[PDB]
Design a protein around this ligand. Sequence first.
Ligand SMILES: *[C@@H]1O[C@H](CO)[C@@H](O[C@@H]2O[C@H](CO)[C@@H](O)[C@H](O)[C@H]2NC(C)=O)[C@H](O)[C@H]1NC(C)=O
Ligand SMILES: *[C@@H]1O[C@H](CO)[C@@H](O[C@@H]2O[C@H](CO)[C@@H](O)[C@H](O)[C@H]2NC(C)=O)[C@H](O)[C@H]1NC(C)=O
Ligand SMILES: *[C@@H]1O[C@H](CO)[C@@H](O[C@@H]2O[C@H](CO)[C@@H](O)[C@H](O)[C@H]2NC(C)=O)[C@H](O)[C@H]1NC(C)=O
Ligand SMILES: *[C@@H]1O[C@H](CO)[C@@H](O[C@@H]2O[C@H](CO)[C@@H](O)[C@H](O)[C@H]2NC(C)=O)[C@H](O)[C@H]1NC(C)=O
Ligand SMILES: *[C@@H]1O[C@H](CO)[C@@H](O)[C@H](O)[C@H]1NC(C)=O
Ligand SMILES: *[C@@H]1O[C@H](CO)[C@@H](O)[C@H](O)[C@H]1NC(C)=O
Ligand SMILES: *[C@@H]1O[C@H](CO)[C@@H](O)[C@H](O)[C@H]1NC(C)=O
Ligand SMILES: *[C@@H]1O[C@H](CO)[C@@H](O)[C@H](O)[C@H]1NC(C)=O
Ligand SMILES: *[C@@H]1O[C@H](CO)[C@@H](O)[C@H](O)[C@H]1NC(C)=O
Ligand SMILES: *[C@@H]1O[C@H](CO)[C@@H](O)[C@H](O)[C@H]1NC(C)=O
Ligand SMILES: *[C@@H]1O[C@H](CO)[C@@H](O)[C@H](O)[C@H]1NC(C)=O
Ligand SMILES: *[C@@H]1O[C@H](CO)[C@@H](O)[C@H](O)[C@H]1NC(C)=O
Ligand SMILES: *[C@@H]1O[C@H](CO)[C@@H](O)[C@H](O)[C@H]1NC(C)=O
Ligand SMILES: *[C@@H]1O[C@H](CO)[C@@H](O)[C@H](O)[C@H]1NC(C)=O
Ligand SMILES: *[C@@H]1O[C@H](CO)[C@@H](O)[C@H](O)[C@H]1NC(C)=O
Lengths: 49, 415, 95, 49, 49, 45, 111, 43
Amino acid sequence: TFLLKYNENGTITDAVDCALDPLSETKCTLKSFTVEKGIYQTSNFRVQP
Amino acid sequence: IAIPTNFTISVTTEILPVSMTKTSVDCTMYICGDSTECSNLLLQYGSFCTQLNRALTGIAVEQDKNTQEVFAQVKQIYKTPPIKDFGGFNFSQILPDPSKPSKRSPIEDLLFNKVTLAQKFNGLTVLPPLLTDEMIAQYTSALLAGTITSGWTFGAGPALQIPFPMQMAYRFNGIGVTQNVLYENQKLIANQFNSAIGKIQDSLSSTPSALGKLQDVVNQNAQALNTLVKQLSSNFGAISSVLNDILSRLDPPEAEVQIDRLITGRLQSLQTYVTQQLIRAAEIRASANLAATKMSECVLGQSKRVDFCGKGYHLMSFPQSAPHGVVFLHVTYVPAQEKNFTTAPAICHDGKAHFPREGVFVSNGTHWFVTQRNFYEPQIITTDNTFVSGNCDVVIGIVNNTVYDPLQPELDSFK
Amino acid sequence: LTVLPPLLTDEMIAQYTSALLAGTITSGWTFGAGPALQIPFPMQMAYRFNGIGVTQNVLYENQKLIANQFNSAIGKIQDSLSSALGKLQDVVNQN
Amino acid sequence: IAIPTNFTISVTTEILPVSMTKTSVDCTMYICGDSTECSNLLLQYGSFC
Amino acid sequence: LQTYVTQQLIRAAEIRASANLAATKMSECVLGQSKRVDFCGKGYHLMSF
Amino acid sequence: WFVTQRNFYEPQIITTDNTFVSGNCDVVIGIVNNTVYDPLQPELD
Amino acid sequence: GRDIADTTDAVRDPQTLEILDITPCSFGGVSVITPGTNTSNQVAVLYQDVNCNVFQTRAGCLIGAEHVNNSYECDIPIGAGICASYQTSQSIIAYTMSLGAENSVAYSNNS
Amino acid sequence: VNCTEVPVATPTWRVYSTGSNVFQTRAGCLIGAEHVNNSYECD
Ligand SMILES: *[C@@H]1O[C@H](CO)[C@@H](O[C@@H]2O[C@H](CO)[C@@H](O)[C@H](O)[C@H]2NC(C)=O)[C@H](O)[C@H]1NC(C)=O
Ligand SMILES: *[C@@H]1O[C@H](CO)[C@@H](O[C@@H]2O[C@H](CO)[C@@H](O)[C@H](O)[C@H]2NC(C)=O)[C@H](O)[C@H]1NC(C)=O
Ligand SMILES: *[C@@H]1O[C@H](CO)[C@@H](O[C@@H]2O[C@H](CO)[C@@H](O)[C@H](O)[C@H]2NC(C)=O)[C@H](O)[C@H]1NC(C)=O
Ligand SMILES: *[C@@H]1O[C@H](CO)[C@@H](O[C@@H]2O[C@H](CO)[C@@H](O)[C@H](O)[C@H]2NC(C)=O)[C@H](O)[C@H]1NC(C)=O
Ligand SMILES: *[C@@H]1O[C@H](CO)[C@@H](O)[C@H](O)[C@H]1NC(C)=O
Ligand SMILES: *[C@@H]1O[C@H](CO)[C@@H](O)[C@H](O)[C@H]1NC(C)=O
Ligand SMILES: *[C@@H]1O[C@H](CO)[C@@H](O)[C@H](O)[C@H]1NC(C)=O
Ligand SMILES: *[C@@H]1O[C@H](CO)[C@@H](O)[C@H](O)[C@H]1NC(C)=O
Ligand SMILES: *[C@@H]1O[C@H](CO)[C@@H](O)[C@H](O)[C@H]1NC(C)=O
Ligand SMILES: *[C@@H]1O[C@H](CO)[C@@H](O)[C@H](O)[C@H]1NC(C)=O
Ligand SMILES: *[C@@H]1O[C@H](CO)[C@@H](O)[C@H](O)[C@H]1NC(C)=O
Ligand SMILES: *[C@@H]1O[C@H](CO)[C@@H](O)[C@H](O)[C@H]1NC(C)=O
Ligand SMILES: *[C@@H]1O[C@H](CO)[C@@H](O)[C@H](O)[C@H]1NC(C)=O
Ligand SMILES: *[C@@H]1O[C@H](CO)[C@@H](O)[C@H](O)[C@H]1NC(C)=O
Ligand SMILES: *[C@@H]1O[C@H](CO)[C@@H](O)[C@H](O)[C@H]1NC(C)=O
């Protein structure tokens, strides 16, 4: 689940991977590249059987 | 005019719920129950899950904001002096008791043990409050020690010490009772105070309903949670109420419609829960804002707002923590033993109309006196004590009398 | 659907209001803090004038005038009241 | 400095709502009244009423 | 019906705020004399009925 | 000793014009034995 | 048997006829502590209600944040009186919140 | 509802519906409560 930042020129300039690391997980959750300081809830995990 | 000859110092409790449990539920689990073949379908309903989660998280952070605003009124925490000579006033019933593992006060302990709700379910969870009960107790102890040991100054600048009998003299003077009323009855005052304070504990032990305004809140939350989880038992017109049965008995192309019915029902139930929670959180926020206003304008000072701080003239209020709420012990000076005298608006001496400086004219049948308006303390009526304005002809209800000129005897003696 | 009656009938609410009003007239502000204690009304108005920072005499010296204004004002509002109550009409209309 | 020399005691109204009509509606008989067939179906939705 | 109940909850919350304001207004203006500026009518406050 | 207004330190000699009398020196707790200057005596002298 | 809902709390094994109880296995929400992308890029994860640098708290299992002894007026809230921040010296530290500086007012009956 | 049609609404429930003591008020009729000419605080 990639989040891609398009540009006014129409050309993709950068991308973020939803599962690369928790920071990128937030960046996907907020739907914004920049994440401000604080505590962020991202997902809910269950132990696989 | 009837004016008092005595007073009683009464402390009245006021409960205020300042926060509620920080519940959160992940829409995905509650609706789909970790059935990926059902989460895929739920994904077709849009951003409902995210919206509900956002609303619940907002309420959750707002609860901690409420507690912070209500309690953390002091930039620094004060420690009451080891020696407990407060001029006869006995605060042992509100101040923290070191004789227990928890740093609570006897009133706080009784208050906390009188409110009661480990249960875990699918999706539903409760987050701990930011300020643990120990920290809320520490804030309450800080405010309480500050108000005992530094008057109202600690709330509006640096903490300026002041002997407690003098602080209560100031608080008396703040309601129109001169200072000499307190000192000349200091011991009596103290006793009443002490008695009242002790009495409050028994009142909190009188009935289980004392903490009702808090209990209700808890109950309400519990009710909502119950009726949410119980809604998982309903099937909303499908052939079964459990997604596992649906997916084990029916193939995907056919089970899709039944899962659609279940998704719609579960989503509607959770939406109703979230909306009710938003209304309830707004109500609790209003209550917590009122609690913060009371803590600021009563504990940190002395209010002229007549019934803001219980019946009587407000003197001082000590806060106490309570599970998801605060309790104020509003101390109030209440007149009593009223005696009724004849009164006049102004006296006349040599045609000059003398009006009382700040008190009021009262006659014990024979000759007049000037007494402050809230405690019968007759003083000889003198030109120093009463000012002058106009003459006889204007005021109605005037009464002839002689106002002692304090300089007459010394003038005659020395000339 | 049904509408449950209010706990306090309009008569009981009017009785409460009359009690508050007579207490204010005949005891000033004392009935709201402790036991109600009488005080002649012009003296109570002197107390209140002192409250707003105008010395006692300024009332008595022209008490008559004060009273007249009061009376007139009260009359006026009745005539002004028979013009509004939009704050309550709005509630009932919304419901 | 400008000092007052006279007064004009004024009386002003202020209307305040205090309570609204206490309405109460049966959900069971509102969704479908005196029809057991629909009441049985409505019972499926659970504790909405 | 759910819509009606939710809207009634909102409206009753508004009316409850108004009733709390009326309660404090009666306490502070009627049972006493208030120093709050525009709380009890415009001008300096004497007494409310 | 001195008399000073609260919440700002402005000492003033204790005088009959800023203190009011009461009691008999036996009921109040914690009194002190200082004196009050009387403005009338210098005028008389 | 059953719990308050239709979810099964206990079951009898049809083979050995033995009683057993069922509990949903370890689960919970996950959050992350970040001091701001425009000031750093490390982050410390927090499992809300799971049992486990690594660190355990009444608010859950916090990893990636290093415990520190002392306390400061705290930046961001974790829970249960525990906060965290990128202060102190280049990583997230989770501590127990401080309320305020101690201030013993010098009180005496004639002062 | 009026006190006339109340009974239309086991033996104890029948008794309560019928009512050895019936009182009529603005909030409809009630059974099992004795009506007095005294007056106390709201309970
Ligand atoms: C004002 O009231 C207090 C009581 O509220 C009076 O003090 C009481 O005096 C009686 C006299 O026999 C004692 O038995 C009580 O124990 C006292 N009570 C307390 C709490 O001290 C006081 O005397 C009254 N003052 C005046 C001037 O009447
Ligand atoms: C202040 O109040 C406390 C009670 O809150 C008093 O301590 C009690 O005193 C009574 C009478 O001697 C004893 O029976 C109790 O055992 C004491 N403890 C408790 C917890 O009640 C105390 O004596 C009062 N005075 C001072 C100066 O502290
Ligand atoms: C009314 O107040 C006076 C106080 O002045 C009481 O005391 C008497 O006062 C008069 C003149 O002031 C003196 O001549 C008497 O000797 C005072 N009596 C006593 C016993 O000291 C007076 O008792 C009060 N009551 C009445 C009915 O006058
Ligand atoms: C109060 O004293 C005034 C002044 O002594 C009295 O007014 C006088 O009453 C006499 C009665 O014959 C008249 O002749 C005078 O003209 C009045 N005025 C003056 C300036 O002397 C008054 O009667 C006394 N009593 C009351 C109740 O006011
Ligand atoms: C990108 O933006 C610039 C802005 O001047 C423009 O000249 C250019 O044509 C745009 N597209 C590309 C491919 O450079
Ligand atoms: C005090 O009130 C009573 C009645 O309440 C009255 O009989 C008495 O005359 C009054 N006292 C005075 C001095 O007027
Ligand atoms: C009211 O009291 C005043 C006070 O002196 C008196 O002059 C007047 O006559 C009294 N009025 C009545 C009707 O008693
Ligand atoms: C104040 O206004 C009233 C109303 O017109 C008037 O009767 C009175 O004389 C005025 N006061 C003065 C001192 O002019
Ligand atoms: C203060 O306490 C001391 C005992 O340490 C005592 O001698 C003194 O009289 C007390 N004074 C006041 C005003 O409380
Ligand atoms: C104050 O002075 C009086 C008389 O001079 C004396 O009786 C009393 O003991 C003195 N008190 C103190 C504390 O010095
Ligand atoms: C079937 O199960 C029963 C119950 O444990 C056991 O006693 C029996 O031996 C089993 N038979 C076979 C063939 O596994
Ligand atoms: C579970 O929690 C308890 C209590 O905090 C602790 O003693 C135990 O070590 C924990 N177990 C695991 C596997 O985290
Ligand atoms: C405080 O510091 C000492 C020394 O490093 C350490 O042993 C102890 O565990 C620390 N306490 C806490 C609560 O972190
Ligand atoms: C109830 O029935 C009685 C008897 O006919 C009648 O007099 C009364 O008006 C009725 N009241 C209502 C509210 O219908
Ligand atoms: C109560 O008042 C009513 C008024 O109609 C009267 O009929 C009745 O006899 C009185 N007493 C009782 C016990 O109802």
